[PDB]
Amino acid sequence: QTIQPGTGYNNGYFYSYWNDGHGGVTYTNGPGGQFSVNWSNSGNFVGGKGWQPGTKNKVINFSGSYNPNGNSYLSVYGWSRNPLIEYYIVENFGTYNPSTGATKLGEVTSDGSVYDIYRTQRVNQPSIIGTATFYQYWSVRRNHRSSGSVNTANHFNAWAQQGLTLGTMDYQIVAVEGYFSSGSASITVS
Template sequence: MKKYFCIKTILLLAICGIVSCSTEQKVPENNEDVSESSAISNLDKFDAYTQKFTDATLITQNHATGHVGDFFFTHWKDGGSASLQLDTDGSFGVSWEGGGYNYVGGPGWHYGDEDRVIGYRFDEESGASYITLYGWGYDETMPESDPAHLVEYYVLQRWTYDPSQNGEYGTTFMSNGIEYSTYRSVRENKPSINGPSTFYQYWSKPAQQQPLEEDHEIIFTDHVQAWAESGWIIPDMNNLNASDDPTYQVMAVEVFNPGQDGTASGQVWDAKAQ
């Protein structure tokens, strides 16, 4: 049985203002250097945001990436109030307040791996826009005028907003006993891991929402193959050449313009490595 976060712990930490059990959170300002001890191999380019924590940590600022134990995390919002609580075993919780803003965050890895099998579990979530495997691919050798040079991808598991209503349908396929359909949409001059850009979003949407309080596995290679079979280009998912963030892959909670306060908590792990 895996260890999962209790949302009461998250709220208690938030109320008490605790940032980390034993490691003070350092929020770099004005692109100052992160200390040598907290630098992460191969990610020095992003040291304005990338930090290393060895204990449970609460993230509250607008934009942060880093590692808690061996898990990478992203935490991004364009306003409002949302926090991300993480532990070194991949347990995490997100808490948000209602308002007119967008938030996405969660733990995973600082690069995408087409062969990765992602294990996860959500014990509770109160109406997030998306519960999703989430990440980016980037190919700087392609012209920026081609939206395929930069891709934001989603393997949805639960949702309150249906992205397929504005998307181009690709194909329907089976993965791990679940029927998914692929969709593609375009974002024009929007925030990305490479600054404001025009890029594609690729979606895999299951026929049914996945239940809470159960262990699940996402076989990522099936989704990559389905996107390719839809005729869509798959850019490099392990590329550190973007300007703002690496091409991470995380189990994310996303909310946009939330109508009320909410929470979500769960755990992520590398199912292939077990």
């Protein structure tokens, strides 16, 4: 069903849908690990399905149609606690590279493409534990795609070699994120 922001479980999978209060987003949970997000002049939003909690060696599969019209990402996305980290393995994005302005730390090859690695910091921002300052870890895929498999261990290990460690995992999903743009997407996770 089409729902407003919230988290829960649907057809065997965890889901998380969040937005900044701006309208224009239509998030809908479907059968199994499927969800769709259609947005028209949204603000910032993040929604998708997966697991609560995630693991440090999960092989995540995704497939679907991803049609962003502006700033948007398609990523394996999740968090850990102690340390508090928001991480991304970006498989596809629209008109804006999320690593713009960030300092590159290295490169890792996984699942058919090179990824560039970066760390950024969010200061006094919303998080799974409320307002907080925390780091974000990024693997940005060079060869964009809308379906495939992500061996998360390759990324977590690559990050660890650069000193980017993860705490106890919280949720881990395949998420569509948008930032003041429009677009359409339908994804199935497994």
